[PDB]
Amino acid sequence: DIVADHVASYGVNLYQSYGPSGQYSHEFDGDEEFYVDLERKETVWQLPLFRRFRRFDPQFALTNIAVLKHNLNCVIKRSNSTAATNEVPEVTVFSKSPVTLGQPNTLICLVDNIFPPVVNITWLSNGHSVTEGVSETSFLSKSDHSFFKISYLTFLPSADEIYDCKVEHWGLDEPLLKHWEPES
Amino acid sequence: GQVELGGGNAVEVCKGSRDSPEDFVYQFKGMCYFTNGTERVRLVTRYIYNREEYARFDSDVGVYRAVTPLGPPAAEYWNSQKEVLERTRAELDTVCRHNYQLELRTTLQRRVEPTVTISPSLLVCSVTDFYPAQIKVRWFRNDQEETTGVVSTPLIRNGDWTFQILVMLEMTPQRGDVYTCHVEHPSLQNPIIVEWRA
Amino acid sequence: GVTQTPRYLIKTRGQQVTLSCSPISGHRSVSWYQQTPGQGLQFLFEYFSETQRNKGNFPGRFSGRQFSNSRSEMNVSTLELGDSALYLCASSLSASGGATDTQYFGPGTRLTVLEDLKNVFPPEVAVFEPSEAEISHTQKATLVCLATGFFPDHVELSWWVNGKEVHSGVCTDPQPLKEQPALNDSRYALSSRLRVSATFWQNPRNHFRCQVQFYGLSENDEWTQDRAKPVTQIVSAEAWGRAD
Amino acid sequence: MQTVTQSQPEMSVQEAETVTLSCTYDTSESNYYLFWYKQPPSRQMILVIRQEAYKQQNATENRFSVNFQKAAKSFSLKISDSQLGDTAMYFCAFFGQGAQKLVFGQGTRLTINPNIQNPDPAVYQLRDSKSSDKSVCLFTDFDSQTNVSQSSDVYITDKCVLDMRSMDFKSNSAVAWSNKSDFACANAFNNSIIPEDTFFPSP
Ligand SMILES: *[C@@H]1O[C@H](CO)[C@@H](O[C@@H]2O[C@H](CO)[C@@H](O[C@H]3O[C@H](CO)[C@@H](O)[C@H](O)[C@@H]3O)[C@H](O)[C@H]2NC(C)=O)[C@H](O)[C@H]1NC(C)=O
Ligand SMILES: *[C@@H]1O[C@H](CO)[C@@H](O)[C@H](O)[C@H]1NC(C)=O
Ligand SMILES: *[C@@H]1O[C@H](CO)[C@@H](O)[C@H](O)[C@H]1NC(C)=O
């Protein structure tokens, strides 16, 4: 293995036939600095610190992803059309900070060991889909070339509200639901 | 800052163009490894089909190499073009070293003080929302460092550029036992100490 | 190298045009540009692996495409008079993502957009023999070629001596002269010089020829006027050496 | 007019002398490429010099060299031993590794004036080889410091530089003609400065 003080992915480049869809993002020490919205041609930094002080032109991403599309076609033929193997994702739900009823907090749903990078992550509050106060990371790279993805739900902890993170992936026989509840 | 760049992916040799759905996945990773500032920098660009890394350029080697039998046609092609080799070798400077200058001004100066709270469950010391990852947590029972009975979760990556870690202590509270949680972090000149008295 | 066709083209307002480009052998990237005197060099779009990777700010009637061997075409529908320009093709190796910095240009397509074809005229060509005074004064002999009354300025002038094209001793005006400077549809005039020694002009066996290639309408072009259809043609004029 | 600036629309230089063409640029890119293109009257865009931002060594291609001052964002082109074939429109170009768009300056028109050793300015009358009634007036062998004025209803071309390579005899010439019956080669170049030593032979 390579031991180093800091590891950066100055180019997590992704393209896949399903969709088709792609992703361009930069990482530093395992956290996402930005992704490029390929449809809108915009660099979307993951911290307000980064947008104020750092520049990245989205055209670099569009160019590189177009090459990935070319490379993918070439290796599909070279591999005699070898399709990706579905992996079984691993899901964990936890809060961002210690839970106190009435104090704004954040639920975190970590979907780990994702491959291929096609997944549904849905928050349920008392059995119903919730999109308000929901955000998520891009696909974050892993050293074994699978991915993980994290979704967030901002919520007010209350004794009368329970939550589920619903994950749908081809490696699962059925939607996987990880349940979470406050102190009481 | 100045416009940052990624690694440019080499173009593959081609000249033109069940129960679950099929998916063909291509990955390219421009990876920079930094040690002791920028004194030791290593560029490794990885070419992956699905999850199979089949070719890579390694700055410690200086040329592309095949990793699996899928790689020889690509590595030989990329090593024969001076416009690919020399440009990739230069990325150790134009990508890794330059971007690091902006990490020094942003990511490497990010210091988020940990929040330390104690709550019973086993006594749980929650250390939440800190960055960077280096942290030291110790349990103390009346100025006596606990060595046995301490169970800590792994370092938890929240994905929003903060970490957290839960350090639990199996203890028996008496009327005179005062438990304190000591947390050391690069954002703190002095340790954070939170007390819990029965 | 980068090759383009057609080199010259006349169109009327509202028609469409398709331009062809073949990049340098092995190059994967083709870029298109428009050069006008009012806007300079304007980027259209760039193609790689049969897909558009980079785009300029031209309207949708400007489009392009690229085929499996990386040859490219661009198209302009509903041509406007302002679309008259030199349309340039440039190729880059592009062996890795981002490596389109070095672009080698083709010859370009001269597109002239007109309201109609009524003012299209081929040139009249005349050759003027050197004066006896120049020969006495300098022992050199300057022949002059004059091409007049042509529109548009899609012309190429060359000199031929005894059936061989010559370049040494030739000077041609860099840009045509407007015969009617006020009229914005004025026909053009162009002059050229060929200067030889007195001994070469004084050999009556030497044959001098000024040849002007004119690019106008095609044989399969509509023409409803009372004069000859101004087709693409070569108009030439000659002179023979004199001993006297 | 903002990313690449060429403040000199026109430039002239004597043959075999040195000329410097100005170019400054403005960018936030960390890695980029700078170019000079030569566009002769044939309208062919010719790549003359290429400079990489991370190679601070000034690029050179035989007679062509650049003064790349990265901190000043200046990229001037020096043409040494100027040749007649250097007469062209010169374009400064910029390509950022991020935006990946080749951007061109407004262009600089360069004219190279020939070296005229023994000037012998003269006006000759040349008869049409087919009709002895038609003729043109030829102003030739004047020095490079002479400018030719245009018109009315009288056509005068700009001056032209030819080269007889068998004797390396360069010479300037301009042509005038007119259909009206009160034309005259002696009168043809009145508006332009005809030097006092110009030869007007008798017909
Ligand atoms: C992520 O969620 C997507 C939205 O629910 C889901 O797409 C949906 O998939 C179902 C079948 O798996 C489609 O239902 C189709 O339903 C029946 C078969 O169940 C067919 O007979 C119909 O003709 C119809 O095509 C939904 O249409 C489809 N939703 C869309 C397209 O918006 C994805 O499968 C989920 N992704 C995963 C699990 O990875
Ligand atoms: C691809 O693999 C199958 C067996 O899995 C084989 O029969 C087939 O011939 C292969 N493709 C080609 C082009 O040979
Ligand atoms: C780190 O590099 C510096 C020089 O850049 C050197 O002085 C120092 O000794 C190095 N430290 C280690 C631990 O290698």
Residue numbers in the entry:
A (entry chain A): 0 to 9, 9A, 10 to 182
B (entry chain C): -2 to 118, 128 to 204
C (entry chain E): 3 to 29, 37 to 58, 63 to 72, 74 to 81, 83 to 259
D (entry chain D): 1 to 30, 36 to 59, 62 to 68, 74 to 163, 166 to 217
How do the authors describe this structure?
We next determined the ternary complexes of three TRBV5-1+ TCRs (A3.10, A1.9, and A2.13) bound to HLA-DQ8HIPL11C. The CDR1α loop and CDR3α loop of A3.10 TCR interacted with the HIP peptide N-terminus. Here, Ser28α-Glu29α-Ser30α from the CDR1α loop formed a series of polar and vdW interactions with P-1-Val and P-2-Gln of the HIP peptide. P2-Leu is situated under the CDR1α and the CDR3α loops, forming extensive vdW interactions with the CDR1α (Asn36α) and the CDR3α (Gln109α, and Gly110α) loops. The A3.10 TCR β-chain interacted with the P5-P12 region of the HIP peptide. P8-Val positioned under the CDR1β, CDR2β, and CDR3β loops, formed extensive vdW interactions via Arg37β (CDR1β), Phe57β (CDR2β) and Ser109β-Ala110β-Ser111β from the CDR3β loop. The TCR A3.10 has a longer CDR3β loop comprising smaller side chains compared to the A1.9 and A2.13 TCRs. This permitted the CDR3β loop to dip into the HLA-DQ8 binding cleft and form interactions with positions P5-Gly, P6-Asn and P8-Val of the peptide. The steady-state affinity (KD) of TCR A3.10 for HLA-DQ8-HIPL11C was higher with a KD of 52.5 ± 2.2 μM compared to KD > 296.2 ± 112.3 μM for HLA-DQ8-CpepL11C. Indeed, the HIP specific P8-Val mediates numerous interactions with the A3.10 TCR which turn out to be key contacts as mutation to P8-Val abolishes HIP recognition by the A3.10 T cell clone.
